[model samples]
Target chain A: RREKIIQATLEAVKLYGIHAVTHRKIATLASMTYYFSGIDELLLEAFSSFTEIMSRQYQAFFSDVSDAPGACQAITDMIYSSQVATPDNMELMYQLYALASRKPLLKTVMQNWMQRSQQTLEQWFEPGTARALDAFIEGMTLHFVTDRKPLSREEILRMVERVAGAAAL
Target chain B: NDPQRREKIIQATLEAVKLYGIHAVTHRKIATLAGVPLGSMTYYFSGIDELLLEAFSSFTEIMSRQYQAFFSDVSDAPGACQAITDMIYSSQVATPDNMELMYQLYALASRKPLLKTVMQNWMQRSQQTLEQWFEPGTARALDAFIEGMTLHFVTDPLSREEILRMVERVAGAA
Candidate 1:
C-alpha cells in the first residue's frame, strides 16, 4: 500500500506538480490515512525516499575509487549515467528546493541530503573539493538533462578534474 | 497610470508565485497581493494566461539585468572570474525570492509554452552576458556552476573563500 501511494504520488507530481497534489486526488489508493499522517507526511516520505536513493547511489558508486584521478573520472561517469536523473527525480528536487527557503523541516532534509553526498565524496578528496565537486555534479546533472546540447564527456571531465585538482594530485 | 497599475499586478503575481506555487495563483490572490481590486486583473490582462506570461516574462528580464549588473564592470579574465565569485558569493544579489522565482518558472516551462519562451529568452540573455568573458562553451559551464553553487549556498554551503577558489579553478584551471 505504501509503495503504491509513493509511486502514484511521484507520477502525479511529475504530471501536475506538488501544489496540485492532494489526498483526494491520490485517494484512488483509497484510505490514504490508513497508512500515514496526511498529504504533507506522505509527500515528505516520498521526497526522502528520493534523496536517500540518491545518497545511497553515491555512497555505493564511490565505494571503490579512492584516488583523485579515479574519483574525478568516476564522478563524471556517475553524473552522466545517474539513473536518478529522470524527470521525476528532477521535478521533486525542484519542488523541494523552492519550498526549503520557507520550510525548516524540508530545509533540514535537503541539507542532510547534500551533506551525505558530500561526506561520501570526502572519502577521496578534501572537504572543500568534495563540496565544490558536489555542486558541479548537481549543476552538470541539471544542464546535462535539460539543455539542448549538453557539454561533451570530455568538456565535463575537464571541469570536474579542475575541481578535483587532478593535476595537483 | 494604467501602466503602473498593470505593472503592480504583474509584480504581485510573481510574489504570489514565489510564496505559493504557480498553480495556486488565482485572480483573487493576485488582487489581494497587488493591493488592487479583483477587477484590475481582467482590466489590464484579458485572461489568467496573459497575466501569468507577463509576470514570468518580466521576471526573466529582471534576471538578465542581475547578471548584467553583476558583470557590468569587468573586462579581463581574472576580474571576470572575481565577478562570478562575487556574484555567487551573494555579495549583493541572489535574494531568497530570486531563487524561488527561478524554480517556480522552470517547473512551469515544460508544462506551459508561455513559460518555455520566457525561460529560453532568459537563458539567451544570461549566456550572452557570460560570453562577454569566456567562450560559449566555458560560459555554459560557468552558468551551470553558478546555478548549482547558488542553490547550494542557500541549502548547504561552502565558505566564501572556498567559493572563490573553486570559481578560479573553473575559470581556467585546465
Candidate 2:
C-alpha cells in the first residue's frame, strides 16, 4: 500500500508537478479509495523514499571505483548516465527543487539529502574540494539536461579532475 | 498614454510569472494584473505565448544590459574576476522572485521551443559578455557554474563567501 502510494505520487509529480499534487489526486491514481490522514505526510514519505533511491543509485556508481581518479570518472559517468540525463528526471528534479522554495519541510528534506551526498564525497576528499565537486556535478548536469550545447563527457571529466585535483588518485 | 497598454500587459505578464509559476500564468491573471480589459490581452497580442515571449525578451534585455555594464568597466583579468564575483554574490540580482521567474522559464522552456530559444539567447549573451574577459571555453564553463551556483543559492542557501570561492576558482583558472 505504501509503495503504491509513493509510486502514484511520483507519477503525479511527473505529470502535474509538485504544487499540483494532492492526496486525493494520488489516491485516485493509486486506485485506493481510502482517506489518507495527511497529504503532506504522504508526500514527505514519498520524497524520502525517492531520496534513498537516488542515494543508493549514486552509491552503486562509486562501488567499483576505490581510487580518487576512478571516483571522479564515476561521478562524471553518473551525471551522463540516463538516471540524471533523462528529460523526465530533470523535469521532476527541478520541479521538486522549485517546490522546496515554498515548503519548509521539503526544504529541510532536500538539505538533508544534499548534506548526506556531500558527506559521502568528504570521505574521499577535503571539505572544500568535496563542496566544489558537488557544485560542479550539479552545474554540469543541469547544463547537460537543459542547454542545447551540453559539455562533452571529456569536458565533464576535465571539470571533475580539476576539482578533484590530487584527490582524484 | 493608451499606446503604453501593450507594454503594461507585458510587464504584467512578468509580474504574474513571478507571483505564480509559469503553469499558472493565464490571460485572465495577466489581464487582472495589468488592470486592462480582458479583450486587450488578445487585442495587443496573439495569445499567451506572444505575451510570454515579449515579457521574457524584455527580461533578457534588462539582464544582458546589466551584464554588459558590469564587465564594460573592468580592464584586466583580475578586475573582471572580481566584477564577476561581485555580480554573483553582492549584486543582489538573484532575488527569490527573480529565481522563481528563472525556474518558471526553465520549466516552460522544456515544452516551448520559443522559450528555449529565449534561454539560449540569454545564455549566449551572458557567455559573450564573459568572453570579453576570458577564453571562450572558460567563459562557457563559468557561465554554467554560475547557473549551478545560483540554483544552489535559491534552493540550498549557500553562503556568499563559499559561492565567491567557487566563482574565483573557475575565474582564477582563466
Candidate 3:
C-alpha cells in the first residue's frame, strides 16, 4: 500500500506537475487513502521513497564505472541521460528545489543527496577536483534545460573533459 | 486611472515573488502589499496568469537591458572577454532576493507555457546581444556557461578567480 501511494505520487508529478498534486489527487489515483491523515504524510513518504531511489541510482552509477574513461562515460551519460535532461524531470527537479526551500524534511534529503554525490565523486578524483566537477555537472545540467540552444553531446563531452582535465592537473 | 493601480500591483507581485516562492503567491498577498483591496487584483488583472505574465515581462526586460549594457561598450573579442569576466566577478551585486526571484521564476516556468515562452524570448534576446561580440557557437556556449556559473556563484558562492578562469576558457576559442 505504501509503495502504491508513492508510485501514484510520482505519477501525478509526471502528469500534472508538483504544484497540481494534492492528497486528494494522490488518493484518487492510488485508489486508497483511508489510512493517511492528509497529503502531507503521504508526500513525506513519497519524497523519502524518491530520494532513496535517487541515492541508489547514484551509488549504482559509481559502482558501475571503475576506470577513468569509464568514469567520464558514466558521468556524461548520467548528466545528459534522458531521465535527467527531459523537460518533465527538469520541472520536477526545480520544483523540488523550490519546495525544499520551505520544507526542512525535503531540504535535509536533498542536502544529503548532494553530499553523497560529492563523496562519490571524491572517491574518483581529488577533493578540489571533485568539487569543481560537481559544480560543473550541476551547472551544465541546468543550462541543458533552460538554455534556448542546448549543448550537443560533443560540446558537453568537451566541457566535461576540459573541466575534468583541469582538475587532473 | 487603472494604470497606476496596475503598476503598483505589478510591482507588488514582484516583491511577493521575491519574498515568497511562486507557489505561495496569492491575490490577497499582492493586494495587501499594494495597499489595495483584494477586489482590485481581479479588477486590474483578469487572473493570476495575467499578473504573473506582466510581472515576469517587466523582469525579463530589465535583465535583458542589463545584459546589453554589459556588452554595449565593448567592440573587440578581448574587450568583450574582459567585460564578461568583470560581469561574472561583479555578479555578486545581484542580491539573494533577486536570486530567489529568479529561481522561483524558473520553477514556475517549468509548467507554465506562457512563462516558458517569456524565458525563451529573453534568452533569444540575450543570445542575439552576445552574438554581436562573439561567434554564434561561442555566443551560445558562453551564454550557457554564464547561466550555469551565475547560478552556482549565487547559490554556493564560488571563488571569483575560479569563475573568471572558467569564463576565460569558454571565451578562449570564440
Candidate 4:
C-alpha cells in the first residue's frame, strides 16, 4: 500500500505517461488482486513527490546496471533528453491532472509542490531565464503530448539556454 | 498623459527588450527609456513579472492581430495563407523580439503556473481559431505543423521561405 502503487505509477509515467497506467498495474505492484475501493483511494492519494520517490526506487529497479563514476551521468542525460520526447510523459501528466481535479486532498499537495519546484528553480535561474524556461517547458510539454514526435535534445537545451541567457541579460 | 505614460513604459519595455532581450531590461532600464524616475515605475505596476507578462502578452496579441488583419485584406485563402507566411518570415528574420519572447515564455510557463495557463489557453485558442479555417480534425494537425515549423525555422535557417511556400500550398489546397 505504502510504496508499491506510487512506484508503479512512476514507472508507468516514465514509460507510458501517468494517464496510461491502470489500477491493475497498481494492484499488481501492491501484490493484490484488483479491487475498486482501495484502488480508487490509492490513485486518489498518490500525489506525493512521485518524481522524488521514483528517483529513490530507481536503484532497486535498475540494479543490474552498474553505477561507476561517470556512468549514471549518461543515464541522467538520457532520462532528461528522452523524457521530453515521449507522449507518454504527457499522458502521465493527464492522469495526474485527472486525479488532481477529482481528489480535493491531492490538489493542494500537487499545487504546493509545483510552486515549490518553481521557487527552487527561481533560485537556480535568474528572473528572465526563469520566465523563458517556464514558457519553453510549456511548449515542449504541449508538443510531447500532441505532436507526433518529441522535440530533440538540442531544442530543449536551446529553449532553456535562451531563457536563462535572456534572463541573465 | 497617464495612458500615454503606460504606453511609453510598455513601448520602452518593448524597445529595450528587442535590443537586449527582456531579461536585460530592469525597471531601472525601462524607466530610463521612458525618461522617468525609477520610483515612478512602482507607481505604474507592482513588479517585473506583471510588466513582463504585459509585454509578452502584448507581443503575442500584436502578432495574432496582425495575422488576422492581414488575412482580412486578402481575397482568397491562398492570399491569407501567404500573408501568414510573410508575417512569420519577416518577424522571425527581421525582429528578434518574437523569438525572444516566445522562448522566454516557453521557459517561464514551467516554473510559473500563472504563465502556464496563459500560454496553454493561448495555444488552445490559437488552435481553435486556426481550425475554424480548415477541415475537421485539422486543428491539431495545423498546430503541430505550425509550431513545429517555428521550432524548426529558429534552429535551422535554410530554405525557410521554401518551407513556408510548401505550407502555403497545402493550406491553399485545403
Number of the top lDDT candidate: 1
Write one digit per residue (lDDT tens) for candidate 3, span A53-90. 77677778779666556666677777667424564455
In TM-score terms, which candidate is top? 1
Could you give the TM-score of chain B for each candidate, in order?
Answer: 0.85, 0.82, 0.84, 0.74
Contacts from the true interface found in each model, as a fraction, amount to: 0.52, 0.34, 0.19, 0.01
Sort the candidates on lDDT, descending order. Answer: 1, 2, 3, 4
Q: Write the number of the candidate with greater DockQ, choosing between 1 and 2.
A: 1
Over the stretch B65-132, how does candidate 2's per-residue lDDT look in tens digits?
87778676788777777677777675445456666556656665666788778888887888888888
Rank by TM-score (best first): 1, 2, 3, 4
Off by more than 4 A, model 4: A1-169, B21-24, B74-92, B157-173
DockQ of each: 0.57, 0.48, 0.29, 0.03
Model 4 agreement with the true structure over A38-144: per-residue lDDT tens digits: 55455555545553443334333334533221222322344355455543334334445444544555556555544443443455554433332333443444554
- Tell me the whole-model lDDT of each prediction, alpha carbons only: 0.75, 0.71, 0.69, 0.51
RMSD of 3: 4.4
Q: Write the per-residue lDDT of candidate 1 for residues A1-169, one digit (tens) a residue.
A: 6778877776666677677888877766335767776778877787777667867876888888877788888887876674234444666677678777767777788888888988887887888878778888887665644443555677777778867775346
What i-RMS does each candidate reach, in Å?
Answer: 1.8, 2.2, 3.5, 15.3
